[PDB]
Amino acid sequence: LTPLTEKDYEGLKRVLRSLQAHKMAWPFLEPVDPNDAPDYYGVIKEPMDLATMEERVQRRYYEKLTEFVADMTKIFDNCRYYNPSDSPFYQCAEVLESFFVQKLKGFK
Numbered sequence: 001l002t003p004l005t006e007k008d009y010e011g012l013k014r015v016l017r018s019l020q021a022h023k024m025a026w027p028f029l030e031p032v033d034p035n036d037a038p039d040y041y042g043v044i045k046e047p048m049d050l051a052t053m054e055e056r057v058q059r060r061y062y063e064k065l066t067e068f069v070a071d072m073t074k075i076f077d078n079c080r081y082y083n084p085s086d087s088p089f090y091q092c093a094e095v096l097e098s099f100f101v102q103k104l105k106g107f108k
């Protein structure tokens with residue numbers, strides 16, 4: 001896989017901001033609050049969120065697009081594992097993952 005260039009990184013920031021602005025992204029914007037989900041961090045061993053990804057983007061943590069996609073997929077995988085399939089939180093992952101794929105393919 002090809003290294004992420006500085007030109008690549010402008011695109012990644014755009015993709016990330018498109019997701020952060022999505023109406024369904026709210027449960028993913030910041031780390032889960034342990035007060036609203038007291039067992040969350042006993043269940044989910046590798047939490048991830050969009051603020052933690054923004055930090056990594058800004059600090060050029062990602063060297064390959066696959067690593068960026070892997071962090072994003074953890075967000076969605078964590079959500080569907082923690083939540084039952086009829087929860088509104090689960091529905092956020094359904095909507096935002098397919099939005100992400102649309103944007104990812106564009107990033108191309």
Ligand SMILES: CNc1cc(-c2ccc3[nH]ccc3c2)nc(S(C)(=O)=O)n1
Nearest residue numbers: 027030031032033036037078079082089
């Ligand atoms: C009850 N189920 C839930 C609850 C939450 C949650 C709760 C409070 C929160 N405060 C700041 C973020 C934040 C996220 N996130 C999910 S998630 C990431 O979609 O798996 N599922």
